[PDB]
Design an enzyme around this catalytic site. Structure first.
Site, PDB file in Angstrom:
ATOM      1  N   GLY A   1       8.675  -9.851  16.982  1.00 35.32           N
ATOM      2  CA  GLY A   1       8.164  -8.735  17.778  1.00 35.32           C
ATOM      3  C   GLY A   1       6.663  -8.623  17.951  1.00 35.32           C
ATOM      4  O   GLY A   1       6.179  -7.606  18.443  1.00 35.32           O
TER       5      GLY A   1
ATOM      6  N   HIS B   1      20.658 -12.442  16.967  1.00 40.71           N
ATOM      7  CA  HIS B   1      19.340 -12.964  17.292  1.00 40.71           C
ATOM      8  C   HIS B   1      18.681 -13.618  16.093  1.00 40.71           C
ATOM      9  O   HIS B   1      18.781 -13.114  14.995  1.00 40.71           O
ATOM     10  CB  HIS B   1      18.520 -11.803  17.810  1.00 40.71           C
ATOM     11  CG  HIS B   1      17.114 -12.136  18.140  1.00 40.71           C
ATOM     12  ND1 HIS B   1      16.705 -12.427  19.420  1.00 40.71           N
ATOM     13  CD2 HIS B   1      16.001 -12.144  17.377  1.00 40.71           C
ATOM     14  CE1 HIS B   1      15.397 -12.626  19.429  1.00 40.71           C
ATOM     15  NE2 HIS B   1      14.943 -12.463  18.202  1.00 40.71           N
TER      16      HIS B   1
ATOM     17  N   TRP C   1      25.624 -10.847   8.085  1.00 34.01           N
ATOM     18  CA  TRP C   1      25.842  -9.764   9.069  1.00 34.01           C
ATOM     19  C   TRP C   1      27.340  -9.606   9.294  1.00 34.01           C
ATOM     20  O   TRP C   1      28.054 -10.561   9.128  1.00 34.01           O
ATOM     21  CB  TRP C   1      25.059 -10.003  10.388  1.00 34.01           C
ATOM     22  CG  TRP C   1      23.564  -9.868  10.200  1.00 34.01           C
ATOM     23  CD1 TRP C   1      22.684 -10.877  10.018  1.00 34.01           C
ATOM     24  CD2 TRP C   1      22.789  -8.651  10.126  1.00 34.01           C
ATOM     25  NE1 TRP C   1      21.399 -10.392   9.845  1.00 34.01           N
ATOM     26  CE2 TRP C   1      21.434  -9.027   9.900  1.00 34.01           C
ATOM     27  CE3 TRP C   1      23.103  -7.288  10.221  1.00 34.01           C
ATOM     28  CZ2 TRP C   1      20.390  -8.087   9.775  1.00 34.01           C
ATOM     29  CZ3 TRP C   1      22.072  -6.354  10.096  1.00 34.01           C
ATOM     30  CH2 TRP C   1      20.729  -6.760   9.872  1.00 34.01           C
TER      31      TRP C   1
ATOM     32  N   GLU D   1      10.561 -18.969  18.432  1.00 32.23           N
ATOM     33  CA  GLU D   1      11.704 -18.079  18.571  1.00 32.23           C
ATOM     34  C   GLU D   1      11.265 -16.620  18.840  1.00 32.23           C
ATOM     35  O   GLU D   1      10.181 -16.243  18.428  1.00 32.23           O
ATOM     36  CB  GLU D   1      12.450 -18.138  17.248  1.00 32.23           C
ATOM     37  CG  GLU D   1      13.923 -17.899  17.348  1.00 32.23           C
ATOM     38  CD  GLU D   1      14.286 -16.429  17.246  1.00 32.23           C
ATOM     39  OE1 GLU D   1      13.431 -15.600  16.756  1.00 32.23           O
ATOM     40  OE2 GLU D   1      15.447 -16.119  17.683  1.00 32.23           O
ATOM     41  N   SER D   2      12.092 -15.783  19.476  1.00 32.93           N
ATOM     42  CA  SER D   2      11.674 -14.390  19.870  1.00 32.93           C
ATOM     43  C   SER D   2      10.162 -14.255  20.305  1.00 32.93           C
ATOM     44  O   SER D   2       9.727 -14.870  21.287  1.00 32.93           O
ATOM     45  CB  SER D   2      12.131 -13.309  18.823  1.00 32.93           C
ATOM     46  OG  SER D   2      11.225 -12.170  18.620  1.00 32.93           O
TER      47      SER D   2
ATOM     48  N   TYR E   1      11.778 -21.445   7.599  1.00 34.45           N
ATOM     49  CA  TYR E   1      10.937 -22.245   8.474  1.00 34.45           C
ATOM     50  C   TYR E   1      10.403 -23.479   7.776  1.00 34.45           C
ATOM     51  O   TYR E   1       9.361 -23.998   8.183  1.00 34.45           O
ATOM     52  CB  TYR E   1       9.761 -21.459   9.043  1.00 34.45           C
ATOM     53  CG  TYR E   1      10.038 -20.161   9.780  1.00 34.45           C
ATOM     54  CD1 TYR E   1      11.032 -20.057  10.733  1.00 34.45           C
ATOM     55  CD2 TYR E   1       9.250 -19.042   9.544  1.00 34.45           C
ATOM     56  CE1 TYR E   1      11.257 -18.856  11.407  1.00 34.45           C
ATOM     57  CE2 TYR E   1       9.454 -17.866  10.209  1.00 34.45           C
ATOM     58  CZ  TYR E   1      10.455 -17.774  11.140  1.00 34.45           C
ATOM     59  OH  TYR E   1      10.630 -16.593  11.816  1.00 34.45           O
TER      60      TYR E   1
ATOM     61  N   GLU F   1      22.697 -11.799  21.680  1.00 31.56           N
ATOM     62  CA  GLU F   1      21.302 -11.413  21.515  1.00 31.56           C
ATOM     63  C   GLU F   1      21.173  -9.950  20.998  1.00 31.56           C
ATOM     64  O   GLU F   1      20.603  -9.674  19.892  1.00 31.56           O
ATOM     65  CB  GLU F   1      20.570 -11.602  22.844  1.00 31.56           C
ATOM     66  CG  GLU F   1      20.295 -13.037  23.192  1.00 31.56           C
ATOM     67  CD  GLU F   1      19.259 -13.753  22.282  1.00 31.56           C
ATOM     68  OE1 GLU F   1      18.442 -13.072  21.630  1.00 31.56           O
ATOM     69  OE2 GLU F   1      19.230 -15.014  22.230  1.00 31.56           O
TER      70      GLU F   1
ATOM     71  N   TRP G   1      13.682 -12.188   6.629  1.00 29.60           N
ATOM     72  CA  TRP G   1      12.596 -12.049   7.596  1.00 29.60           C
ATOM     73  C   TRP G   1      11.298 -11.375   7.131  1.00 29.60           C
ATOM     74  O   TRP G   1      10.271 -11.554   7.817  1.00 29.60           O
ATOM     75  CB  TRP G   1      13.093 -11.320   8.797  1.00 29.60           C
ATOM     76  CG  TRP G   1      14.327 -11.873   9.311  1.00 29.60           C
ATOM     77  CD1 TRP G   1      15.529 -11.255   9.369  1.00 29.60           C
ATOM     78  CD2 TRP G   1      14.509 -13.171   9.862  1.00 29.60           C
ATOM     79  NE1 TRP G   1      16.451 -12.063   9.955  1.00 29.60           N
ATOM     80  CE2 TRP G   1      15.858 -13.260  10.260  1.00 29.60           C
ATOM     81  CE3 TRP G   1      13.652 -14.276  10.081  1.00 29.60           C
ATOM     82  CZ2 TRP G   1      16.383 -14.409  10.850  1.00 29.60           C
ATOM     83  CZ3 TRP G   1      14.164 -15.408  10.686  1.00 29.60           C
ATOM     84  CH2 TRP G   1      15.517 -15.465  11.067  1.00 29.60           C
TER      85      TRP G   1
ATOM     86  N   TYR H   1      22.078  -7.578  16.981  1.00 31.93           N
ATOM     87  CA  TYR H   1      21.186  -7.303  15.866  1.00 31.93           C
ATOM     88  C   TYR H   1      20.313  -6.066  16.031  1.00 31.93           C
ATOM     89  O   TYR H   1      20.004  -5.404  15.074  1.00 31.93           O
ATOM     90  CB  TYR H   1      20.318  -8.493  15.664  1.00 31.93           C
ATOM     91  CG  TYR H   1      19.165  -8.308  14.761  1.00 31.93           C
ATOM     92  CD1 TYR H   1      19.310  -8.500  13.409  1.00 31.93           C
ATOM     93  CD2 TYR H   1      17.906  -8.059  15.271  1.00 31.93           C
ATOM     94  CE1 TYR H   1      18.236  -8.416  12.550  1.00 31.93           C
ATOM     95  CE2 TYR H   1      16.821  -7.959  14.449  1.00 31.93           C
ATOM     96  CZ  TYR H   1      16.990  -8.133  13.074  1.00 31.93           C
ATOM     97  OH  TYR H   1      15.909  -8.049  12.213  1.00 31.93           O
TER      98      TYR H   1
END
Ligand SMILES: *C1O[C@H](CO)[C@@H](O[C@@H]2O[C@H](CO)[C@@H](O)[C@H](O)[C@H]2NC(C)=O)[C@H](O)[C@H]1NC(C)=O
Ligand SMILES: *[C@H]1O[C@H](CO)[C@@H](O[C@@H]2O[C@H](CO)[C@@H](O)[C@H](O)[C@H]2NC(C)=O)[C@H](O)[C@H]1NC(C)=O
Lengths: 532, 534
Positions: free
Chosen positions: B118, B438, B430, B198-199, B129, B325, B82, B328
């Site tokens: 965020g 998420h 994870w 997304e998010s 992506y 959700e 990320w 994470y």
């Protein structure tokens, strides 16, 4: 027949022998234990029954206490079963003893039965409260008694010498005092007395538990579908007088003694007629004259009295029936009758809630709705009904009972908790009302055994099991078998919270007597009421 | 190759050719779409890139907007996927275009991707992506744009003309406008254009539904795992300024306002970024400092109020959550939690965790939250509390929001289709307790299993393909399922009363009903009343 004449600290008594498909029993009905509560003595505490010449007839159930009568579904089995079945008199303070044949030789344990229906109604004479079967099948003395209900037992102006409140409770206590003095004379052990009762009876038992001077007159307690900490079961000085004066006015009249003597005069049936008018909002499962927290008979609110009480090595057996709520619905809840399916619609459910859970703010209400609605199917009227059944059931019976059980265990009482989930084949009431409030009594009192009645003969085998549990409890403070043969009935306790089911199948042991819902009613809801 | 040269309204672009197990795709990476938002332009709306002479090398991903870089598990695979893979620059307003190797002669349809993160992070250039797989395999045009995140995109001193707020959203919009004027020259049909994110990318998309000027620019919407009405995704003018100021303060400094802002246009970007996390009201998980603002401008009013009172006829929208959700987010600050243990928390850490999970809310509102989420037969049980806390965070911040929107949209004329992506990728680094966490639906939607080098089970590639189909289908028609096929598993419309959603995993579609219904009644209907009467 030596067996049927007896002497009690107040005079002689002629009993009447009684008839059982398994044995016989001596019974003494209508023993006067108080000076009739009348004219000037109405609304006052009982006075002990003055001694008496010659021999008192005791062959026959005495008159029922003056009380509302259920004109709702005239002549239905299930409604009428609970209605009075003798003269109504204000002269109603009598009790009944059942002892086995022959009177047994060494001191045997006594079951004392306090009867039900919201402090407004009930009598010790109804068919369903018949000693014989229980006294015979299990040899235990059994007493039941009559106490003043509705305004005659419970009206209070807290403060007055005039109507000081709780006199129906005082009435019960005098019956227990008479039981100390006298049960000796019938083979009963003044020092092994188990109280049991149901609905307001169960709440009564519990009040005796919380009230010292009662506390020496029994040793064990059974609470059947009622708890003195229920929302319906008491009422404090404030409302108590507000509702007493509001009757006085509502009946023409009238400054404290004035209001009372001026009310001691109205005929009985007029007071009865205005009883439900004082209730201060439209409501199911709420009654007008109930015990009051005056600072005397109840020292403080029964929650607080119960949080900090004296319980160590008290053994108590407590329970509830599978569907506590339903029975009540058909009495003020929009869209209910025995006759139809009572399938309701949302907006009826919603006004239902405000009537199940009277006089609680609208935040409180939306709280309930949120818990009780099935937001997956907010509409389905099956659910919505079983729902409003739960709402009334939990709020008023289950949750108060689970709380008491918990709080008692944790101050070291051996508590046994049941859930009674059998629908009597005999049952007058719609298949929808499931197992309703009251339909455990029939089997605890051993009624199936009277073959003059239609019970399956597996039901008669249950009836015996239950009576055993009850009598075992009475005898030893443990309802089960004194043999690791069957499955065990484990004590209820604060953490594990184990109850058993009572039906035809054998004892299954479950955990969590309606645990999530009680979290809501007992813990959260009060915080929300005193925040908002 | 002359498949790779293209003329856009601004000038000329050289593209690049990308391999696929099943073909090749022509990629145009890092087309400039705005003048650099630098110097006196930091905080300001974006200005359209002006024409250039020569050919812009569009053969590789341009810079990442400046952002905070998470260093919680450093060099951990599930954390670095990320973080930026290019240098940070304030000069970052570029987009990318992927198009099919025989450049379609038919006006083929368009998918525009908006990254999440965020509002404080993320780049269109991340590996996850990659357009190539969904393009080569569905013959669509795919656009991903960069947009300013954190203070650079979202700091607002509302009302003043110097920090107007919501410029990240503006950046996005202008990229949309560029797709109108230009997608044409690649294949794409400037009509049939689908937004997906997304998010915060999803809630971005959300805001574009609610903002009239943007509304002309796309036809259909996808909201994965976020909604604009979520508690985290917008802030009111009060806090906005409270927070802009608080920043200006820790960074040294200072009409006024003008004076504050331009004394902040002077600080190196890196410096702004290091003080970012320092400006938040209280300790919290899933809250971000600079997010879009209800200024009354871009967002006419609180996006919930708008969502409520609004006509959505003629709109088709595909929304969804993943299975877990919440999980994470807990490893960034709930008491007791780690990727590295079993995060088997204590009751005491749970009550503790709820306050960081549902920040700034009365103790009675907290106690309500506790009531709903506790098992009262097992109040003490660790795993249950771990799950429960993971539900509290996930419910309140994602699902409940998504559900609320989706309800309201369908009941007001939208035609809405819900999913719950529940497949745990075989490669997930994870811990198992985290479930499908998420963000972990993306690889699949974008079809990354199809890349040779990523060791994904071959049954997963089928899954991937499968999904790109519902997505491309939804892109084309406003409806995910093959239209010529009564035969195959239906995906029904979600619907205020029936509430149906499919499940997406390796099994053929299931249809469940109720999207955490009982919880969402607590979050969306009950709690607001509680909160605003106490
Ligand atoms: C793994 O979880 C353990 C518990 O199993 C965590 O223990 C606590 O976590 C906090 C951070 O939230 C630390 O500051 C403390 O050292 C721990 N406190 C207590 C009460 O024991 C731990 O953080 C996790 N990670 C590791 C290995 O550091
Ligand atoms: C049985 O159910 C019906 C609905 O199925 C009940 O409905 C109403 O009852 C109210 C009082 O609560 C009356 O004022 C209405 O006029 C009734 N309307 C309907 C829909 O019938 C009904 O009370 C029940 N009992 C019967 C058979 O009288």
């Amino acid at each position: 027949d030596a067996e049927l004449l007896v002497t009690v600290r107040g005079g002689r008594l002629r009993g009447i022998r009684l008839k059982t498909p398994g044995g016989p029993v001596s019974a003494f009905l209508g023993i006067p234990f108080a000076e009739p509560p009348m004219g000037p003595r109405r609304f006052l505490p009982p006075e002990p029954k003055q001694p008496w010449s010659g021999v008192v007839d005791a062959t026959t159930f005495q008159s029922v206490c003056y009380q509302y009568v259920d004109t709702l579904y005239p002549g239905f089995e299930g409604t009428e079963m609970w209605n009075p079945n003798r003269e109504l008199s204000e002269d109603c303070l009598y009790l009944n003893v059942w002892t086995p044949y022959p009177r047994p030789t060494s001191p045997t344990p006594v079951l004392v039965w306090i009867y039900g229906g919201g402090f407004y109604s009930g009598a010790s004479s109804l068919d369903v409260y018949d000693g014989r079967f229980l006294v015979q099948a299990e040899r235990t003395v059994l007493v039941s008694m009559n106490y003043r209900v509705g305004a005659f037992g419970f009206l209070a102006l807290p403060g007055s010498r005039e109507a000081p409140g709780n006199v129906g409770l005082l009435d019960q206590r005098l019956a227990l005092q008479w039981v100390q003095e006298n049960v000796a004379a019938f083979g009963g052990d003044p020092t092994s007395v188990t109280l049991f009762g149901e609905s307001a009876g169960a709440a009564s038992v519990g009040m005796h538990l919380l009230s010292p001077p009662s506390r020496g007159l029994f040793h064990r307690a059974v609470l059947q579908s009622g708890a003195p900490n229920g929302p319906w079961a008491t009422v404090g000085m404030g409302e108590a007088r507000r509702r007493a004066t509001q009757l006085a006015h509502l009946v023409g009249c009238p400054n404290d003694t004035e209001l009372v003597a001026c009310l001691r005069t109205r005929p009985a049936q007029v007071l009865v007629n205005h009883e439900w008018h004082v209730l201060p909002q439209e409501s199911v499962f709420r009654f007008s004259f109930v015990p009051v927290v005056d600072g005397d008979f109840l020292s403080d609110t029964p929650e607080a009295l119960i949080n900090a009480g004296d319980f160590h090595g008290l053994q108590v057996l407590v329970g509830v029936v599978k569907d506590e709520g339903s029975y009540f619905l058909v009495y003020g809840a929009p869209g209910f009758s025995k006759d139809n399916e009572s399938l309701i619609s949302r907006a009826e459910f919603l006004a239902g809630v405000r009537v199940g859970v009277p006089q609680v703010s609208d935040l409180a209400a939306e709280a309930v709705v949120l818990h009780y609605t099935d937001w997956l199917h907010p509409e389905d009227p099956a659910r919505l009904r079983e729902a409003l059944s739960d709402v009334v059931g939990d709020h008023n019976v289950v949750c108060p009972v689970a709380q008491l059980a918990g709080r008692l265990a944790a101050q070291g009482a051996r508590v046994y908790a049941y859930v009674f989930e059998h629908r009597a084949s005999t049952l007058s009431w719609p298949l929808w009302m499931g197992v309703p409030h009251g339909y455990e009594i029939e089997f605890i009192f051993g009624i199936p055994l009277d073959p003059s009645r239609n019970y399956t003969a597996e039901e008669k085998i249950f009836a015996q099991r239950l009576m055993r549990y009850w009598a075992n409890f009475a005898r030893t403070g443990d309802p089960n078998e004194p043999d690791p043969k069957a499955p065990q009935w484990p004590p209820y306790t604060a953490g594990a919270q184990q109850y058993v089911s009572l039906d035809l199948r054998p004892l299954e042991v479950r955990r969590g007597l309606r645990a999530q819902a009680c979290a809501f009613w007992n813990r959260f809801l009060p915080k929300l009421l005193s925040a908002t």
